[PDB]
Design a protein around this ligand. Structure first.
Ligand SMILES: [Zn+2]
Ligand SMILES: [Zn+2]
Lengths: 55, 55
């Protein structure tokens, strides 16, 4: 679930996903990664979410 | 200077430049951005730096 975040980010930066599909998938993955206990994936998904949301 | 950060991130996630080179270029860009007065790109470069440095 760490390569999925980078896959979504990479496909966003090439302009093949939108700010709507990407955020939906990344919040689903952050939900998975916050109920798993990983603090190294909570923050990974959080950084990806901040990048896709605003910037 | 907003496309430079995305180019560095996109070439890092693609796994074809480096971790050292990406962080060096992004610290240069963050220095320019913090000596420009635009906090819309200060945090963009800071997020890219957090991603490349740690995750
Ligand atoms: Zn990543
Ligand atoms: Zn960006």
């Amino acid at each position: 679930l760490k390569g999925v975040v980078d896959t979504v980010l990479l496909y966003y930066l090439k302009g093949e996903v939108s700010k709507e599909a990407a955020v939906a998938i990344l919040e689903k993955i952050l939900k998975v990664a916050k109920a798993l206990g990983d603090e190294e994936l909570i923050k990974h998904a959080s950084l990806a979410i901040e990048h896709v949301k605003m910037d």
